Design a protein around this ligand. Structure first.
Ligand SMILES: NC(=O)c1cnc(C(F)(F)F)nc1
Ligand SMILES: NC(=O)c1cnc(C(F)(F)F)nc1
Length: 284
């Protein structure tokens, strides 16, 4: 029975190595990683790989690993796939902990934009969770944290993290993580998966996929939203992605909205993440 070595980048930036039989389905690897992480609320997570065009794809747990990674390395990342709209309702603190690690990367990477004060407040909860109570001995007037808090660090930001950290004395790690999440969950781009696309006139837009539905970012002054209930059908054909928007009351027919994706693979990838979000957030 021939086994393939798998390398998974965990949310703390460390590398897990394991072996699975070469015909293994994605679920096999995912279960091994989740057992390693002592994670029971696994439904919010998945594994990504980089395809032959270097795009992030979700590993499908139902299909063979080899048929997905194809010509590429058996190299994966462990990630949040479905961001809970209300992290307080997760049953385990360790679930909320991995969600925090994902969100810290979402912030540092610039995928999750965040005001100065929110960057500093989220930072202060991370520091409280990781180091415990503010200690002046570790922090002088010229202190810079090892912690990455933002896509661009300033001395003013480092100072504001410390000032807010002082306010958190006696806060336990689970408590600081819950405050981190109570704040992060409100950010306009929280759990929004962005896809570059063109509308039916060739104007460049972004499509966001999330718990509440499909978002269409045109300009700052033109953002369209389709709640999952208002979507009847999700389809792709060639480089095109279509959604069937349900008839309004007393309207005779469904409306159809058409988008152009960069290539056929980009169209299918958007279709699959949409169907998966629809199913997940229909049931949750
Ligand atoms: N959310 C899930 O339960 C889930 C399971 N398994 C996988 C895998 F194996 F493809 F990575 N991705 C997601
Ligand atoms: N833009 C927001 O929804 C938002 C979230 N969280 C905060 C925090 F941390 F300062 F309280 N400020 C703003």
């Amino acid at each position: 029975p021939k086994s393939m070595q798998c390398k998974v980048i965990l949310l703390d930036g460390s590398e897990y190595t394991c072996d699975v039989e070469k015909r293994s389905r994605g679920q096999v690897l995912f279960d091994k990683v989740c057992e390693h992480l002592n994670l029971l609320e696994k439904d919010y997570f998945g594994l990504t790989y980089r395809d032959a065009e270097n795009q992030k794809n979700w590993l499908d747990p139902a299909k063979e690993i080899k048929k997905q990674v194809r010509s590429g390395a058996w190299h994966f990342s462990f990630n949040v796939k479905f961001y809970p709209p209300d992290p307080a309702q997760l049953s385990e603190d360790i679930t909320r902990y991995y969600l925090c690690l994902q969100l810290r990367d979402d912030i540092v990477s610039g995928r999750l934009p965040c005001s100065f004060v929110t960057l500093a407040l989220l930072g202060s909860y991370t520091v409280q969770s990781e180091l415990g109570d503010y200690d002046p001995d570790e922090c002088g007037s010229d202190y810079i944290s090892e912690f990455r808090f933002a896509p661009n660090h300033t001395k003013e930001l480092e100072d504001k993290v410390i000032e807010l950290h002082k306010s958190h004395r006696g806060m336990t790690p689970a408590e600081a993580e819950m405050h981190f999440l109570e704040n992060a969950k409100k950010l306009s781009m929280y759990g929004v998966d962005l896809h570059h696309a063109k509308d039916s006139e060739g104007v460049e837009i972004m499509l966001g996929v999330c718990a509440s539905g499909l978002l269409i970012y045109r300009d700052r002054l033109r953002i369209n939203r389709f709640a999952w209930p208002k979507v009847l059908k999700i389809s792709y054909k060639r480089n095109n992605f279509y959604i069937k928007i349900r008839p309004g009351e007393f309207e005779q027919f469904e409306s159809t909205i058409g988008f152009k994706l960069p290539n056929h693979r980009a169209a299918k990838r958007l279709w699959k993440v949409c169907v998966e979000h629809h199913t997940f957030f229909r049931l949750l």
